[PDB]
Amino acid sequence: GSSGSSGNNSLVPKYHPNFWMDGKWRCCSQLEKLATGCAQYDPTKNASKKPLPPTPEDNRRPLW
Ligand SMILES: [Zn+2]
């Protein structure tokens, strides 16, 4: 028994820095009910840091 999984993203993780009114957003003013964030995330503006990515492996190989 357990729980906790992660998926993959397609487009930069945006957000709505404004509210939605008048059948349309205020920050982006989109025309979709599930309109995805418009403002792109912020690399600097944050309270966390991540190290550099690891290195890949060599040519494929069987599992025997
Ligand atoms: Zn927006």
Side-chain angles (χ1 to χ4, degrees):
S2 194
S3 176
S5 277
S6 291
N8 318 324
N9 89 60
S10 56
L11 210 288
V12 195
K14 285 162 202 205
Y15 64 101
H16 294 302
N18 287 58
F19 196 51
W20 153 43
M21 290 186 277
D22 195 72
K24 74 160 187 283
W25 282 94
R26 287 282 301 276
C27 43
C28 41
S29 315
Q30 271 177 71
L31 34 87
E32 291 162 287
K33 52 171 210 164
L34 284 157
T36 323
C38 55
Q40 283 177 341
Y41 75 94
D42 311 318
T44 62
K45 207 278 165 300
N46 271 335
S48 308
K49 208 271 197 277
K50 194 185 180 161
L52 290 169
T55 53
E57 65 209 294
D58 56 56
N59 291 53
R60 77 282 306 170
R61 71 150 55 200
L63 38 289
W64 84 271

